[PDB]
UniProtKB/Swiss-Prot annotation:
Name used for this protein in its record: Fatty acid-binding protein, heart
Binding site for octadecanoate: 127-129
Gene3D superfamilies: 2.40.128.20
Family: Belongs to the calycin superfamily. Fatty-acid binding protein (FABP) family.
Cross-referenced InterPro entries: Calycin (IPR012674), Fatty_acid-bd (IPR000463), ILBP (IPR031259), Lipocln_cytosolic_FA-bd_dom (IPR000566)
Entry comment, domain topic: Forms a beta-barrel structure that accommodates the hydrophobic ligand in its interior.
Matches recorded under Pfam families: Lipocalin
Residue list for modification Phosphotyrosine: 20
Location in or out of the cell: Cytoplasm
Modified residues (Phosphothreonine): 8, 30
Principal location listed in the UniProt entry: cytoplasm
Single annotated GO MF: oleic acid binding
Length: 133
């Protein structure tokens, strides 16, 4: 059910990312670098285990998880969160919880592009990724 998300994806559009980062308390200097970074996201599957890599000239992350099973995560901005990823309406929904706060990272395929919607507080960011061959 996750299979159309798998592969290597490159950032090609970003809307409201500074709002999202600011809502999370990211400092201005980090926001400035991040606003000019174009990550590569790699999503791979081995049986029930997904691995999601995010690579850039600034911050690099990797998580592995089973759909529907909570996992500990340390985010790129150093938040220590409780996470769960699940398919919902064909979208890959990643929920992070910490300190009573939540943020969602929702991935949906639209016309072959991967649209990542990031919500925290009132901030809603949309990032578009295109598949690499
Ligand atoms: O995958 C993406 O496109 C993505 F990198 F934007 C992300 F992973 F979704 C993200 F969650 F938004 C995030 F990692 F960029 C963050 F949460 F904004 C962040 F950690 F705060 C950061 F911007 F990376 C910071 F530099 F502050 F550390």
């Amino acid at each position: 059910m996750v299979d159309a998300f798998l592969g290597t994806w490159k950032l090609v559009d970003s809307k409201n990312f500074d709002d999202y980062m600011k809502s999370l308390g990211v400092g201005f200097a980090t926001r400035q670098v991040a606003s000019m970074t174009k990550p590569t996201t790699i999503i791979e599957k081995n049986g029930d285990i997904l691995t999601l890599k995010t690579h850039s000239t600034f911050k690099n992350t990797e998580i592995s998880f089973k759909l529907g099973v909570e996992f500990d995560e340390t985010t790129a901005d150093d938040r220590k969160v409780k996470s769960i990823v699940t398919l919902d309406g064909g979208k890959l929904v990643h929920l992070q919880k910490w300190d009573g706060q939540e943020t969602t990272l929702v991935r949906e395929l639209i016309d072959g592009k991967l649209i990542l919607t990031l919500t925290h507080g009132t901030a809603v960011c949309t990032r578009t990724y295109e598949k690499e061959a």
